[PDB]
Amino acid sequence: PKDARHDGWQTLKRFLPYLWPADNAVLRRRVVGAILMVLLGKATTLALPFAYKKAVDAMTLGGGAQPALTVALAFVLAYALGRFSGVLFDNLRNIVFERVGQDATRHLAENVFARLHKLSLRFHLARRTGEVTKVIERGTKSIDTMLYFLLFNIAPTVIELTAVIVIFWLNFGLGLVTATILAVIAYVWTTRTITEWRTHLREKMNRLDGQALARAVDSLLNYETVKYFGAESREEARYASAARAYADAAVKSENSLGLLNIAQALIVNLLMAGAMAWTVYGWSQGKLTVGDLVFVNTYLTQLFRPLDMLGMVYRTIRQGLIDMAEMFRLIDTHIEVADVPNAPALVVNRPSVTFDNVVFGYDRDREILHGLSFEVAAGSRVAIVGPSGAGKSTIARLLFRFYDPWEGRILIDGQDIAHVTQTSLRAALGIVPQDSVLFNDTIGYNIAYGRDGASRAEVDAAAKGAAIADFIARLPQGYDTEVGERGLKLSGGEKQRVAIARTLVKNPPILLFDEATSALDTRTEQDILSTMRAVASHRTTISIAHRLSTIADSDTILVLDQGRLAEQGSHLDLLRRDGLYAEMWARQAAESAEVSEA
Amino acid sequence: NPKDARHDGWQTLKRFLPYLWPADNAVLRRRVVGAILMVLLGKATTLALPFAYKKAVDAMTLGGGAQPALTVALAFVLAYALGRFSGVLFDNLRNIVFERVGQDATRHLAENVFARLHKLSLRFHLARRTGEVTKVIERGTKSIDTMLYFLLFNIAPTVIELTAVIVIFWLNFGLGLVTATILAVIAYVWTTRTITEWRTHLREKMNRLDGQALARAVDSLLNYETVKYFGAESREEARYASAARAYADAAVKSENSLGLLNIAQALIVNLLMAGAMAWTVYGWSQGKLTVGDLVFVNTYLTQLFRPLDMLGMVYRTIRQGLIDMAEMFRLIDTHIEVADVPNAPALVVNRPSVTFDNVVFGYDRDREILHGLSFEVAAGSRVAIVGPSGAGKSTIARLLFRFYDPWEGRILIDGQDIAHVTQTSLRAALGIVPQDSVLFNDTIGYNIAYGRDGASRAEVDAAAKGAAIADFIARLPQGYDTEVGERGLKLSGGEKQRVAIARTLVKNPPILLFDEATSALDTRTEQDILSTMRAVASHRTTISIAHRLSTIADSDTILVLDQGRLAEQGSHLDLLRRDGLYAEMWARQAAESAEVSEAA
Ligand SMILES: CCCCCCCCCCCC[N+](C)(C)[O-]
Ligand SMILES: CCCCCCCCCCCC[N+](C)(C)[O-]
Ligand SMILES: CCCCCCCCCCCC[N+](C)(C)[O-]
Ligand SMILES: CCCCCCCCCCCC[N+](C)(C)[O-]
């Protein structure tokens, strides 16, 4: 299986089950029909030059003005009809297949998509919409072009080349056979080596093009700054030099194409010259008819027509195979966090949260949690705070099982979250993160996202609960207002309110505020804090906060130092202890005063 | 006037022709001539080579005058092969010789448009998304290049060949044959075109669906965390699958239609083939035509219809290329709102005063903002401009840099109306630190050096020091070669403002503008940067446009705008004493800060 040379062959064999699904009968029928269309089309194209030979033969055999007229007429008509017919077969093959190709590549994409969702968070799925989109577009085009070239250019040509070898064998040579085989070998090898050089030139040209283009775009998007420094002439010169570098590279790449074409023309035409000369010489001895010259000429031109594209085909087939290989590598990549076999669902009857001696870090060379233990009582409002090395920023990620502890365990109710299904676990958890994100869709879609079947009544109830309902009411399209971009832009407080609403639709027993107000301004922070307190009403709530004043009303506060629980208690008890929390409090207070000073 | 014509493809091409035939470069003109010669040689060769084929056949079937027939046939066969290779050689030599011409012409068109875009008014608001613009321009470049190549090296050679084939078929056959092939070409073109319009529409629908599917997938992947938080994986998968199926259906239709065009083309071509070959053989029956003639006619027809095998795509591309090119010329045509007057003198700043003289202005003609604004800023003085929401102060810097002209009134620097001087000299007199400074996609050292064209490493260092950003750059791994902006290291607002101060330091302008310079900063950052700003304001005329009055209270004088006019003028104390608009504002701002101080 995967235990193989890892070449184009393996990638292709891996793709083969998509083309021959074994789920779908209809597609299998289509593949068969397409193959029949290939065989018919080749049969037709091989046959039609014989029709040409006969017409010539009848006019040359050949004592004057004879029934040769009827026969020659019949044969030219057969030849023309054959030409049209082969085209009909080829286009019919394309048509019958296209559904197969489209389905197979779709299923491959869907499999990759699903896996990418199963894979680890640590794969840094935070990047540019444009860059990713360009890459995926490029690869999609790559794999498609590749499939079409492989199935409908290379394979028919292998069949035709073999048939021409058998035919040329039976009726000529075998000097003819060796000459054409050597010609094909030289043609392929030459095309290949020149193509490798050409692909390198293409890459350089492409990179230069990107550079000139980046210069123009950066310049234009910075029109104000360019005016401010009166730098138009400068930017023009800057663009122009880049544009010149690009043009030089383009001239080189395009010229190298002329070289490949000429090289190919020489090979084909030496073969033409030799084959036709030899055919004439055979005719001179009465061994071969005059029709034979036409026969050989047609056979060779037909053979070498698909190889006219060979260079491009090769580059393309190469690139696609690379890209597919890449696809499969992702499908192959192992999943860091998995449900154990036959994992039970989490059942939350009492929503306590326990951290039991948790040792964790993102990377094995940097340990963040050094044996963290704490208990959060069901229904309590708790805060987790600490200074810079405390490790509090891991809590949410550990709790939703984005990662597993190196050592120790996390429990909800009485249960190790490592031993339950990931879906049931996340089903018990609500989060309002620091930067909530909106999908590119309506406010309603975004709120409804909290639970799969969510009704509009539910969206309304949640929107009320987060107090974003009036704002939505004052939009013309209300809940059908598109947001994100290109959509309406929301303020930070508005987005946090959507996030809270989303969680309200989910309606979880355990709710996490993960630096929820950290990006908000003061007035916004104070406003959203009452909504948060209200929404915390009959849930176990864990608030992870930088600014202590925002969490002072907590039932209890857990203070972390150096990956362990340093202090615990209510805000007054902690101030009374004169410990780490008290110090932080003083410090934050002092800074608040300082800003007020100025 | 060439611009005085119907707006079609012909006009667009005629506009492009001077780029192809420069009358500046000459070398390129030679290349164009040479390329045309390669077209002619290549055509002569391809038209000639079937005759060599015809003759070879003739020597084999009427070997009476052509002997030794083996020798005659061989010589002709070799002639034919040599001819094939030769036509290919001419064609590629033509491409090679032209390619520099093409690249240069399109480069110049691009440079003309670029220069224009910089000349056009700010109101076209040229700040938008990099990815979209880049993909569009890439699309347009590919589009125009492809149409040029198809026009010069597919359509035109085919016209030459088609005419030649008509003259030849005329002299030596038919002329029923001439009519038949011409009818065939006409049917072929018409069928191809009508099918192509339909196909192009299907292509557009397909493409739009593809983008939609890709966007759903990308939104999901970039939102892996949120998708996780809500257990929404299956939902997102189904959501991708639905779009993906819509795309696949559209693609299937589009590719199927390709099969229809190909089949229609083959029907037309092959009917012609059948008729021509029948007519030729029957002509042979009557002793009119040689058997070589059959081969000759067949070869001629296949050669004629090979470049037309691409006709559909070709048609789609050339059309699009022409549209895109027209768009280019439209930009070049668009008139310039703000221009130097003819033979404009340089602005000469000896004493750097600034005068606003009865200035009436608005961005748009139905909304007037400045209603006759007048003020004098003394050379070397430090002044602030403040006002409430409708005062119009946000226009001042834009008027000074002549992004726009006053509707009425004028602006003077050192007694010279800025409308009548060269824009470059005027802008040379002015420094600005704007509210949001922007960085080029390049190193931080480049961004600082940008203040003056020839800026030395030393000047950059001095400016960085004056901006108090030198220490920060030192602690960068790559120092001045640290890449910044998008695709680069992210700088804080204060860091960006400090880079802007450094650029202005490199520039060393006589007059300096702080245009809401600290308005995007937090309080401490603002307080830090203000001392730097004051130091750099030392011996310049400085104009500070500020929302927050406390940040400008130490000004030599303060200009208070209300409703597009000068309401109040004077020192911060004179203004508090008057108990006027500035006083009210001051009081209110103080109140607000205290209220904010309250929440702690
Ligand atoms: C309809 C075609 C769907 C198949 C999936 C296409 C995704 C292409 C991504 C290829 C990128 C691989 N890589 C990283 C080497 O570029
Ligand atoms: C939105 C209007 C587009 C006009 C922009 C033209 C600026 C010149 C950039 C052309 C780039 C040429 N290229 C891609 C070959 O480098
Ligand atoms: C071959 C290089 C010539 C400059 C390339 C400029 C690209 C032009 C893109 C124009 C597209 C505008 N549009 C879609 C409205 O037609
Ligand atoms: C690291 C990049 C690999 C990501 C591949 C994701 C494949 C998602 C499917 C996108 C296919 C777009 N399509 C086929 C509709 O054009």
What residues of A are in contact with residue B128 (Cβ under 8 Å)?
A: 221
Cis check: omega of the bond before A366, within 30 degrees of 0: no
The shortest CB-CB distance from A216 to any of B77, B114, B262 is to B114
Task: Report the distance separating Cα A183 and Cα A177, nearest Å.
Answer: 10
CB-based contact B258 A77, cutoff 8 Å? no
The DSSP element (H or E) to which A109 belongs, if any, is helix A68-118
- Class of A1-341 per CATH? mainly alpha
* Amino acid (1-letter code) at residue B528: D
What residues of B are in contact with residue A91 (Cβ under 8 Å)?
A: 258-260, 262-263
Task: Report the distance separating Cα B62 and Cα B590, nearest Å.
Answer: 113
Q: Is A26 on the interface with B (CB under 8 A)?
A: no
Q: In angstroms, what separates the C-alpha of A369 from chain B's closest C-alpha?
A: 22
Task: Report the distance separating Cα B39 and Cα B20, nearest Å.
Answer: 16
For residue B162, give Cα distances in angstroms to B156, B165, B270, B325.
10, 5, 17, 28
Q: How far is CA A7 from the centre of its chain?
A: 21
CA nearest A252: which of A199, A187, A190? Answer: A199
Q: Is A427 on the interface with B (CB under 8 A)?
A: yes
* All residues at 6 or more sequence positions from B193 whose CB lies less than 8 Å from its CB, including other chains: B315
For chain A, report the end-to-end CA distance as a whole number of angstroms. 70
Task: Report the distance separating Cα B535 and Cα B382, nearest Å.
Answer: 12
The shortest CB-CB distance from B214 to any of A88, A103, A136 is to A136
Q: Which residues of B are annotated as a binding site for ATP?
A: 363, 387-398
The DSSP element (H or E) to which A187 belongs, if any, is helix A175-221
Going from N- to C-terminal start, the domains of chain A cover 1-341, 342-598
Q: To which residue do tokens 């940040």 refer? A: B551
- What length does chain A have? 598
Q: Which two tokens stand for residue B163?
A: 């005419």
Q: From the candidates A280, A403, A495, A505, which should be mutated to test the interface with B, based on the most B CB atoms within 10 A? A: A280
Q: Is A502 on the interface with B (CB under 8 A)?
A: yes
The DSSP element (H or E) to which A412 belongs, if any, is strand A407-412
Q: Is the CB of A105 under 6 A from ligand 1?
A: yes
Q: Which two tokens stand for residue B159?
A: 């016209």
Q: How was this structure determined?
A: X-ray
The answer to whether domain B343-600 has CATH 3.30.2130.10 is no
**Are the C-beta atoms of A358 and A369 separated by less than 8 Å?**
yes
Q: From the candidates B70, B281, B399, B548, which should be mutated to test the interface with A, based on the most A CB atoms within 10 A? A: B281
Q: Which two tokens stand for residue B35?
A: 């390329």
**Are the C-beta atoms of B564 and B392 separated by less than 8 Å?**
yes
The helices-and-strands tally (H runs, E runs) of chain A is 19, 12
Q: Is B84 on the interface with A (CB under 8 A)?
A: yes
Q: Which two tokens stand for residue A521?
A: 């301004």
**Are the C-beta atoms of A466 and A497 separated by less than 8 Å?**
yes
CB-based contact A426 B228, cutoff 8 Å? yes
A388 is in an annotated binding site: yes
Q: Is B99 on the interface with A (CB under 8 A)?
A: yes
The DSSP element (H or E) to which A422 belongs, if any, is helix A422-427
Q: Which two tokens stand for residue B537?
A: 């304001």
Interface of B with A in 195-254 (CB under 8 A): 210, 214-215, 217-233, 235-237, 240-241, 244-245, 248, 251-252
Q: Which two tokens stand for residue B512?
A: 């300096």
CA of B327 to the centre of ligand 3 (A): 7
Task: Report the distance separating Cα B433 and Cα A126, nearest Å.
Answer: 33
For residue B589, give Cα distances in angstroms to B393, B586, B600.
18, 5, 19
A427 is in an annotated binding site: no
* Amino acid (1-letter code) at residue B118: H
**Are the C-beta atoms of A265 and B84 separated by less than 8 Å?**
yes
CA of A67 to the centre of ligand 1 (A): 62
Cis check: omega of the bond before A310, within 30 degrees of 0: no
**Are the C-beta atoms of B263 and A87 separated by less than 8 Å?**
yes
**Strands A482-483 and A441-442, bridge-based pairing:** antiparallel
- Alpha helices by DSSP H, A222-290: 223-228, 232-284
Q: Which CATH superfamily is domain A342-598 in?
A: P-loop containing nucleotide triphosphate hydrolases (3.40.50.300)
Three-class SS state of A4? coil
CA of B596 to the centre of ligand 4 (A): 49
CA nearest A120: which of A329, A338, A324? Answer: A338
**Are the C-beta atoms of B559 and B519 separated by less than 8 Å?**
no
Residue of A nearest to B447 (CA): A225
What residues of B are in contact with residue A218 (Cβ under 8 Å)?
A: 130, 440-442
CA nearest B258: which of A91, A339, A300? Answer: A91
Task: Report the distance separating Cα A48 and Cα A236, nearest Å.
Answer: 60
The shortest CB-CB distance from B232 to any of A227, A437, A449 is to A449
CA B332, B338, B342, B346 dihedral sign is negative
Q: Is the CB of B138 under 6 A from ligand 3?
A: no
Interface of A with B in 144-183 (CB under 8 A): none
Task: Report the distance separating Cα A555 and Cα A363, nearest Å.
Answer: 34
CB-based contact B114 A239, cutoff 8 Å? yes
Kindly report the number of other CB atoms within 10 A of residue A83's CB atom.
Answer: 21
CA nearest B536: which of B558, B562, B513? Answer: B513
CB-based contact B221 A125, cutoff 8 Å? yes
Q: Provide Rg for chain B, Cα atoms.
A: 36
Task: Report the distance separating Cα B147 and Cα B149, nearest Å.
Answer: 5
Report angle CA B579, B585, B590 to the nearest 5 degrees. Answer: 105
Query: Dihedral (C-alpha) B69, B75, B81, B86: value to the nearest 10 degrees?
Result: -150
Task: Report the distance separating Cα B229 and Cα B251, nearest Å.
Answer: 35
Q: To which residue do tokens 């949640």 refer? A: A462
Three-class SS state of A512? strand
CA of B169 to the centre of ligand 3 (A): 42
CB-based contact A290 B440, cutoff 8 Å? no
Report angle CA A238, A242, A245 to the nearest 5 degrees. Answer: 145
**Are the C-beta atoms of B178 and B169 separated by less than 8 Å?**
yes
Strands of the A415-416 sheet, one edge to the other? A369-376, A353-360, A407-412, A415-416
The shortest CB-CB distance from B281 to any of A76, A132, A228 is to A76
The shortest CB-CB distance from B222 to any of A125, A228, A595 is to A125
The residue whose C-alpha atom lies closest to atom 3 belonging to ligand 2 is B137
Task: Report the distance separating Cα B284 and Cα B269, nearest Å.
Answer: 22
Cis check: omega of the bond before A62, within 30 degrees of 0: yes
Three-class SS state of A540? strand
The CATH architecture to which B1-342 belongs is Up-down Bundle (1.20)
- SS3 percent helix, strand, coil of chain A, rounded to 5, is 65, 10, 25
Which long-range contacts link A358-364 to residues 24+ away (Cβ below 8 Å)? A358/A398, A358/A405, A358/A407, A358/A408, A358/A409, A358/A410, A359/A405, A359/A406, A359/A407, A359/A408, A360/A391, A360/A394, A360/A398, A360/A403, A360/A405, A360/A406, A360/A407, A360/A408, A361/A406, A362/A122, A362/A403, A364/A406
Q: Which two tokens stand for residue A155?
A: 């394979």
CB-based contact A290 B230, cutoff 8 Å? no
Phi, psi of B515 (to 5 degrees): -110, 90
Task: Report the distance separating Cα B384 and Cα B556, nearest Å.
Answer: 8
Task: Report the distance separating Cα A356 and Cα A367, nearest Å.
Answer: 16
Mapping DSSP onto H, E and C, the string for B235-256 reads HHHHHHHHHHHHHHHHHHHHHH
Q: Which residues of B are annotated as a binding site?
A: 199-203, 262-265, 309-312, 363, 387-398
